[PDB]
């Protein structure tokens, strides 16, 4: 995260780090949806152009952390994967459409002060909230700039941006599920996510009923926090009925 | 699911984060 | 640069 602050104890209970079991490594961020079940990006887990294909035995998934580094006692629990499930028109040849997937987990975790869930979108949510100028929240542990590793989780609030702006801002195609946020060049503020932060999530709380809401996931950018550039992210929403049926299917 | 989004230490004890506020702002 | 995690997690 680019020109974010350290996290709030207890202020991403939902968030979930991929960790690599040999050599032991960051991967990812992802995200709590339930006792047993973690979303992130299909980049996460898959991207032959950088000889990446992951099976369950490689990864651990850390819950409730705030330390990047350390090994948080009696606070993160570190869980097994059962299955990894990517969606199926995943498209790591072009341009990361439908950058989604689940993993399951051998073992339900139990929840904590630091360690619960966020909700996914219903269709008005998603129809009341994804509206440009609204804000929502990204947190990781990924690089602070483009070219320098943070000590503790990272949170930066970003205003959701018109598409057209988006598409104007890349020559990558972009397809409807995806969303692109941050601020632009006359707005002044700054902030991104940046390489590292991939597969986190983007929230945004509802002023309806007060709770946390995953409308995003961290998929791509070029470069991180530049000016006339944007962060992009799998659009949640869109693809809640993949979700579904994998969750109803196992 | 039920309890989904109400983080124990802010919600559920009618505690705000730090810049939470910056959000609601936003829902114009 | 990570702090080791236990054992009974990488069995
Ligand atoms: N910088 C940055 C990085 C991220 C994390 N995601 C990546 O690192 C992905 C993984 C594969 C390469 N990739 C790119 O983002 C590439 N820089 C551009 C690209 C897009 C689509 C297809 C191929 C390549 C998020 C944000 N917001 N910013
Ligand atoms: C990824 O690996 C799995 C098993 O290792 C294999 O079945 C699958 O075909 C691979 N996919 C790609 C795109 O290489
Ligand atoms: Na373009
Ligand atoms: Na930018």
């Known amino acids: 995260i680019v020109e974010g602050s350290d996290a709030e104890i207890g202020m991403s209970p939902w968030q979930v780090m991929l960790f690599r079991k040999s050599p032991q490594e960051l991967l990812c961020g992802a995200s709590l949806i339930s006792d047993r079940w973690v979303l992130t990006a299909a980049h996460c887990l898959l991207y032959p152009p950088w000889d ?3 099976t369950e035995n490689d990864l651990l998934v850390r819950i409730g952390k705030h ?19 990517i969606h199926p028109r995943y498209n ?18 139990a929840f904590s002060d630091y ?15 994804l509206q440009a100028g609204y804000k929502g ?10 070219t320098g590793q943070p000590s503790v989780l990272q949170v ?15 020559r990558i195609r972009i397809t409807d599920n995806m969303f692109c946020a941050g601020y632009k060049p006359d707005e002044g503020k700054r902030g991104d996510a940046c390489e590292g932060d991939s597969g986190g999530p983007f929230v945004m709380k509802s002023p309806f009923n007060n709770r946390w809401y995953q409308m995003g996931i961290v998929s ?13 992210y799998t659009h949640v929403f869109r693809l809640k009925k993949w979700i579904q049926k994998v969750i109803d299917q196992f | ?18 810049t939470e506020r910056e959000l609601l702002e936003s829902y114009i | 640069d990570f702090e080791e995690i236990p054992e009974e997690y990488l069995q």
């Open chain 1, 92 to 109: 790591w040849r072009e341009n990361l459409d439908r950058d989604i997937a689940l993993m399951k987990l051998k073992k339900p975790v």
């Open chain 1, 156 to 170: 930066v609030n970003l205003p959701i941006v018109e598409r057209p702006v988006c598409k104007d801002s890349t």
């Open chain 1, 67 to 85: 330390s990047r580094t350390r090994y948080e006692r009696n606070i993160e629990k570190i869980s097994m994967l059962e299955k990894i499930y």
């Open chain 2, 1 to 18: 699911e039920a309890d989904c989004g109400l983080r124990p230490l802010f919600e559920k004890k009618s505690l705000e984060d730090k």
């Open chain 1, 220 to 232: 791509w950018g070029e470069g991180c926090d530049r000016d006339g550039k944007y962060g992009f």
């Open chain 1, 137 to 146: 929240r990204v947190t990781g542990w990924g690089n602070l700039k483009e």
């Open chain 1, 52 to 54: 990446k294909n992951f």
């Open chain 1, 115 to 129: 360690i619960h869930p966020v909700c996914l979108p219903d269709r008005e949510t998603a129809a009341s909230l």
